[PDB]
Amino acid sequence: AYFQSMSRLPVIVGFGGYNAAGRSSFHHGFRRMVIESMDPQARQETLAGLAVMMKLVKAEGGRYLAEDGTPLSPEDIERRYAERIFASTLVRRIEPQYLDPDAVHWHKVLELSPAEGQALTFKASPKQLPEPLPANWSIAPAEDGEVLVSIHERCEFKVDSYRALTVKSAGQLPTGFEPGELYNSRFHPRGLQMSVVAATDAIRSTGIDWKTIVDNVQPDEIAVFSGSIMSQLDDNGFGGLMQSRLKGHRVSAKQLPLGFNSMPTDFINAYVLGSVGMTGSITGACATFLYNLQKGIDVITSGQARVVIVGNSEAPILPECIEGYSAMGALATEEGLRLIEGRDDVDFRRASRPFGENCGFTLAESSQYVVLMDDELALRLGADIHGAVTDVFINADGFKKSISAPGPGNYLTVAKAVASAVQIVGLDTVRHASFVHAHGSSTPANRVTESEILDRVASAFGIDGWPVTAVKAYVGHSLATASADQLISALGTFKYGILPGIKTIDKVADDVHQQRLSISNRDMRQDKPLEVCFINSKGFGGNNASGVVLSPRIAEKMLRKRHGQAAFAAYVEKREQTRAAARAYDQRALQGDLEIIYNFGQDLIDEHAIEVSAEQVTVPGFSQPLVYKKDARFSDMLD
Amino acid sequence: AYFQSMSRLPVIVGFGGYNAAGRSSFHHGFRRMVIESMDPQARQETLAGLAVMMKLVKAEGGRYLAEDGTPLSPEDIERRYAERIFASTLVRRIEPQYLDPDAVHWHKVLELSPAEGQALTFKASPKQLPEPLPANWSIAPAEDGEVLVSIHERCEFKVDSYRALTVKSAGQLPTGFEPGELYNSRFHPRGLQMSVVAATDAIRSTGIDWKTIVDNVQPDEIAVFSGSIMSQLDDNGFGGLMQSRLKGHRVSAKQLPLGFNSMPTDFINAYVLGSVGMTGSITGACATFLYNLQKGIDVITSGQARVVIVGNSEAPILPECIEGYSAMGALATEEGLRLIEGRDDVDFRRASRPFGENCGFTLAESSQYVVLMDDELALRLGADIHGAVTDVFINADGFKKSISAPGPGNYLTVAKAVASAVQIVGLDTVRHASFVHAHGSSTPANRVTESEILDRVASAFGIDGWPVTAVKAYVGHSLATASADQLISALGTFKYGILPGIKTIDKVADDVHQQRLSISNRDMRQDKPLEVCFINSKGFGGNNASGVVLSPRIAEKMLRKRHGQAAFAAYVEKREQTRAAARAYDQRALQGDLEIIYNFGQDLIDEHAIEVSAEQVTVPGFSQPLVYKKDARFSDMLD
Ligand SMILES: [Cl-]
Ligand SMILES: [Cl-]
């Protein structure tokens, strides 16, 4: 260290995934969020794609069929289905495919006592009786292998019972879209299904054959960083691990391994990419994706990896997660929303109200990935550029009281992020062509503390009217994946020049600090295109992060400057072909033809054919040898 | 990228923690593992310290008292207590303070049916009855607020029952040592208690006031990387989250946040160090510590951080974890060991038999930390050097079938690790003064697959008689913390020149690949001091890592070469004082005076006093301003 020398620039060459707004690739999810602001062709295309995903129309030979068989144009689909599509996307009341928020199962303790008046007696299979038999219970032989049991003392049974959750809303994938139906997903937790399906969307969005990418780098130069913050807590993962015996049965052979928080990452190496490269799963509570992204940037700038898949997968819409967050007072409850609305019949579509009158966050599911390459490899392959990522800063809070309360670290991350952007694009561009993807979690603490940080950093850097957007208004809070939802939305702003409004609020709460911020409940189109986005995130445990994302225009200027006009022109030619391939994928995806990659048990490396020498390793299936890298770090310390 | 320029060297300036061998700092745990090979003063000192930890003797005014009050010398302690100390440390049968492995609670499903012969009737409190009331049940009023219930149809109750686990053994902290008693640990999961207590041991082992360290760096230049792979699954964490309602009660306000796998890290920032610096928790299954260590090395070499606390905390000795791993066939069972021994009364102290006849790993608890500094800061502060860490390589397995089966990535990590060491210390030193801390998990698959990798890398680099040691023989497999147990043991080999034997095996299994390896069941002392250790690790999910650790001698030669004789002499003088301070801590720790740091609710930063400008941030409580770092990475892409 001291300072970093000239380095590879991380460019975003693909992105994809799924959240409550739909499919992320090609900006479809973004378009759903700003659907009314899009032109009709873009809107109708996205609506048609949602209709297919949701099984509202049948994709038949490039056309669309109603339940009647009636052929529909995209214009007809908007007329006929827009209301249903809108009602069955974004934050909304929790639907039965997850749970019934008025009837979740638990066990009550039922204390049964006998007394002088009536016997407490039953017949039972002896194999179902407690072991050892409770000493006070009577047992006698009965017919058909059963025994006659009588109880003489108070004891505790557990009985099935049903209760209502105080929280009724969540950010849910579009109703009817089922990731598990898209590949051989038997026994996989929902978070793993979502990771597999999202990863394929991201990889195919590049318009480049994965084989071509692998053939162009060393085997160790591919990296994947993903994971969840909860672990996979459904029945097929740690839910089964922790609950099976309390429900009367054994733990399965797969519940423990498939529950690990690294499995969204591990499944991508094992079944999607077939990578022998770098891997890891980094958590930082609700800033987790930016923690993974920091690692991704660092491995590119240090030269360790040239292709990086960075993302997360979280599927936390489960009664235990909801109760766990509720127990902290963290979530928007029905009663909380009743107070804000001043009526009993709440609009759960407005449960998430960043910077407005609000009362806690809304839990959501999402899996999102970006594909990064170094600039030189992107240039070589004709990879498209959706943006560039230059830094992520992470700072804890110092000493704390409550571990989950907000703290000062986010001052440091935002300040450092802005300063870093000034060095790269200049003060004027930061002042007049940057925006903030606010953490915007929809809590009274966040709206005050986050706005105060942004306002004070704005003042320090001489920014006024700093545009702020809050993706959680649309898709809720997907925990690990939250800042990936932010990043991907940001890319849509670069594409279409629209800053999504916070449409769920009627006005900004009176206690929000606004002097230097522009927070709107309407979509906005800036005269001067936005060139830089600051992604802001935080979580429990003194976790804070801010990321810097540059637009395609800025990134292209940078590649042109470094590589020159001849090399850039050659890149442009190759990129016309990769753009055509990507568009063809988007067209298939619109039709529901997603071709999920799940390569279980295929193309396994024969380890006995790995060749190791003192100069390199040859790995079966990889055309490029892994040549050990010459080290200059400590050369002055030697001899 | 392309290649890294001259860089800061990560040096190990402190280390500490707790596992089945005892306190890690000052090599006490190491000494327990090679206790019979130590000289009597070192052995008796460690035994006395264990005796105090285990409450077998009372530390009274620098002396030691038996239950009788009889004063004891360390020589007397060895005579009187060695047998008990040995029996109550290391891998052994699971003790009651964890669970009874012949009587773990669960619920059986008890199907109660009535028939023509006897009524099924009981009185109950109506508040304990299912909601809604099962439609077929009869209810009538009764005395004292209770109701009379009768059942007419088969239904399912859950009843308490007790079962035996097939696994009876684990690596357990020394019997009598209780981390929770050492600080205000109310409502903390065991893994968090262990993290807090281990972190203090590591920090105090440096012999430098934490304040002095903080005063010498910028606020963002401190980093902490830790975590667990399971999450905290005990009652106070995700166990309570996932089980409360199945046991009849509500989830608490703390079970969810304190269960997160990042909390071992978050607690250190919040309550131990008061850091506003970098943070993160990286998982890679049973290679996790090396994944955290890779991040630690990278932040030092890139200049992002100057002081890094790297470690892990795992406390997985819980019925659900044991059953979950057993369900995979991963653990050594009593029946498995009976087959190896050919008798029914198994020696559970030999449950873990790396490279011998064996039958699965042994689950263990451990929390371990190392304190890293860049070489320049270490020089400035007179920090001691226990070793240096130059690289960690991580490689996945490519396409897989079973996600938990072994794969080829570890070929790549070991090969790259060895090549990297050759560049730094030369081929001769690698060939004749290096050793391997084998993953050595005690499974039939591992003993073959790992030995084949090591043998084939040895052949490639012309190594013969490559010494191999396996720490899991002593302390079992602590999951996230496993490779920290390895690293810390390695430091002991550097200190004392002893390579611990695999004492639990009688000979190496016939299928182990040994041509170029030296695997012994006895402690060994090499004529030529060992200078380099390769730490090898792997886990489920296609996770593999290998780390390179250099001895103090090598690291000192390197610092002398870079910084020169005058600067090194000044360092030596300061280091005499820091060594004296560290020794004084070790003396207090021997007496049970550990002074655990837990600074809840104290010294909180007043966020309104944070000052942000376009040049720097001033943070209350930190003498050094955070000055934004000048970036040269992309300068050629600008203007
Ligand atoms: Cl908010
Ligand atoms: Cl083994």
UniProtKB/Swiss-Prot annotation, chains A, B:
Keywords, alphabetical: Acyltransferase, Fatty acid biosynthesis, Fatty acid metabolism, Lipid biosynthesis, Lipid metabolism, Transferase
Outcome of gene disruption: Cells lacking this gene show an attenuated growth due to a defect in de novo fatty acid biosynthesis. Siderophore secretion and quorum-sensing signaling, particularly in the rhl and Pseudomonas quinolone signal (PQS) systems, is significantly muted in the absence of fabY. In vitro, the deletion of fabY results in an increased susceptibility to a number of antibiotics, including vancomycin and cephalosporins. The antibiotic susceptibility is influenced by changes in membrane lipid composition which lack a single secondary lauroyl group, resulting in hypoacylated lipid A.
Residues in Ketosynthase family 3 (KS3) domain copies: 83-551
GO cellular component, one term: membrane
Pathway, per record: Lipid metabolism; fatty acid biosynthesis
InterPro entries: Beta-ketoacyl_synthase (IPR000794), FAS_alpha_su_C (IPR047224), Ketoacyl_synth_C (IPR014031), Ketoacyl_synth_N (IPR014030), PKS_Beta-ketoAc_synthase_dom (IPR020841), Thiolase-like (IPR016039)
One protein family per Pfam: Ketoacyl-synt_C
Molecular function via GO: 3-oxoacyl-[acyl-carrier-protein] synthase activity; beta-ketoacyl-acyl-carrier-protein synthase III activity
Chemical reaction(s) catalysed: malonyl-[ACP] + acetyl-CoA + H(+) = 3-oxobutanoyl-[ACP] + CO2 + CoA
Matching PROSITE patterns: KS3_2 (PS52004)
Keyword Transferase: yes
Protein origin, superkingdom: Bacteria
BP-aspect Gene Ontology terms: fatty acid biosynthetic process; lipid A biosynthetic process; quorum sensing; siderophore biosynthetic process
EC number(s) stated in the UniProt entry for this protein: 2.3.1.180
Matching PANTHER family: 3-OXOACYL-[ACYL-CARRIER-PROTEIN] SYNTHASE, MITOCHONDRIAL, POLYKETIDE SYNTHASE-RELATED
Family: Belongs to the thiolase-like superfamily. Beta-ketoacyl-ACP synthases family.
Subunit relationships: Homodimer.
More about this protein: FabY is a FabB/F homolog that functions as a FabH.
Role played: Involved in the initiation of the fatty acid biosynthesis. Catalyzes the condensation of acetyl coenzyme A (acetyl-CoA) with malonyl-acyl carrier protein (ACP) to make the fatty acid synthesis (FAS) primer beta-acetoacetyl-ACP. It can also use short-chain acyl-CoA as substrates, including butyryl-CoA, and hexanoyl-CoA, but does not use any of the longer chain acyl-CoA substrates.
Name of the protein: Beta-ketoacyl-[acyl-carrier-protein] synthase FabY
Organism whose genome encodes this protein: Pseudomonas aeruginosa (strain ATCC 15692 / DSM 22644 / CIP 104116 / JCM 14847 / LMG 12228 / 1C / PRS 101 / PAO1)
Lineage summary: Bacteria, Pseudomonadati, Pseudomonadota, Gammaproteobacteria, Pseudomonadales
Gene that produces this protein: fabY
